[PDB]
Ligand binder design. Structure first.
Ligand code: NAG
Ligand code: O3D
Length: 354
């Protein structure tokens, strides 16, 4: 169990102005720190944020958060469940800003909601330095789904924050799970007039303006004013990053298929070619990513699932691949770090989740 702490700086808030926070379980015999970013889509105007506040309020407010959380998967402290980092200091940062962790805007008489995701991460890091993070050797910033994209958007800013605060010895690294998407053509499509019809690129473009969203500086300088939405897409922002980042991505991600208007519910030839081309394109974007784990499965998220130990690529599990990554940051015989399936159809890998 990890224990809730609400942020001492109460000006760093969830959507509705309640304080943000983090759950923490300390491991005094360890100088490794894992900070995990929760996911859960986003909202991008008044209308659909109001809807989200009715039926997804824990993603917009801390008023109903429980006092403890059980760590699962990579956040578990039992070696049977977590072969990788079971003895680490564990932190779960709830997603209550609805901004893919990019926002820097307070609630005001102009703004019905606050979008403070980028500032929440910075304030959590600041307050943890007083609770033992000052002695760390590695800070691993991890996340799933919207939290995985949040890793890509924030890992270099955490590294810069610790450098400017006088801790140049802490090695900052990233682990992005299920946050690597393609701005591809949809299988069926519609013009953006409402939430159901707005393609990812157009919805993110509106969100960035609504949130006062922030992107990494080198990426921002490449694409420039009005085009910051490009930096939400992994294959475009990753080459601009300096911190080591490990990328976990199902080749047939259920959220990718959702935004592409694909439902698997007898597949004819047009859809067969579409699905095979999506897998090939995703594989192409990872070809020069040296730390990656990409199985040929239809699924979504993995690193905080308890059975995350089950899936294998070329005979190597995800906990093993992450351990090999650790060794590489001190090729290795029999301990690989780049693992991408080559078979072209969902569940052609027999270790895929059922
Ligand atoms: C609280 O957080 C806000 C937003 O990041 C910042 O402007 C302010 O300086 C912080 N307050 C303190 C006392 O650090
Ligand atoms: O799809 S998600 O789980 C993770 C990514 N975010 C924003 C996004 C959409 C496309 C690219 O980046 C939405 C929720």
């Amino acid at each position: 169990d990890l224990r809730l702490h609400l942020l001492l700086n109460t000006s760093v808030t969830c959507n509705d102005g309640s304080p943000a926070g983090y759950y923490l379980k300390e491991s005094r015999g360890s100088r490794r720190w894992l900070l995990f970013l929760e996911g859960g889509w986003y909202c991008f105007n008044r209308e659909n944020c109001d809807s989200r506040y009715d039926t997804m309020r824990r993603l917009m407010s801390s008023r109903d958060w429980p006092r403890t959380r059980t760590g699962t998967g990579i956040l578990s402290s039992q070696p049977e469940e977590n072969p990788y980092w079971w003895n680490a200091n564990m932190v779960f940062i709830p997603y209550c800003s609805s901004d893919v962790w990019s926002g820097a805007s307070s609630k005001s008489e102009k703004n019905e909601y606050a979008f403070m995701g980028a500032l929440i991460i910075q304030e959590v890091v600041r307050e943890l330095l007083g609770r033992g993070l000052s002695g760390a050797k590695v800070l691993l910033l991890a996340g799933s789904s919207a939290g995985g994209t949040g890793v890509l958007l924030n890992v270099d800013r955490v590294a810069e924050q610790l450098e400017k605060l006088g801790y140049p010895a802490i090695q900052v690294r990233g682990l992005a799970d299920s946050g690597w998407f393609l701005d591809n053509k949809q299988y069926r499509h519609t013009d953006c007039v409402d939430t159901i019809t707005c393609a990812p690129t157009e919805a993110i473009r509106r969100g960035i303006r609504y949130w006062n969203g922030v992107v990494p500086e080198r990426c921002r300088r490449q694409f420039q004013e009005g085009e910051e939405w490009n930096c939400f897409f992994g294959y475009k922002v990753y080459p601009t990053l300096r911190s080591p980042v490990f990328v976990v991505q199902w080749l047939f991600d259920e959220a990718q298929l959702t935004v592409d208007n694909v439902h698997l519910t007898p597949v004819q030839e047009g859809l067969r070619l579409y699905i095979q081309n999506l897998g090939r394109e995703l594989r192409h974007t990872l070809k020069d990513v040296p730390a990656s784990f990409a199985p040929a499965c239809l699924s979504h998220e993995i690193i905080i699932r308890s059975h995350w130990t089950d899936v294998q690529v070329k005979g190597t599990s995800l906990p093993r691949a992450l351990h090999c990554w650790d060794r590489s940051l001190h090729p290795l015989k029999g301990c690989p770090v780049h693992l991408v399936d080559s078979c072209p159809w969902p569940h052609c890998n027999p270790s895929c989740p059922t």
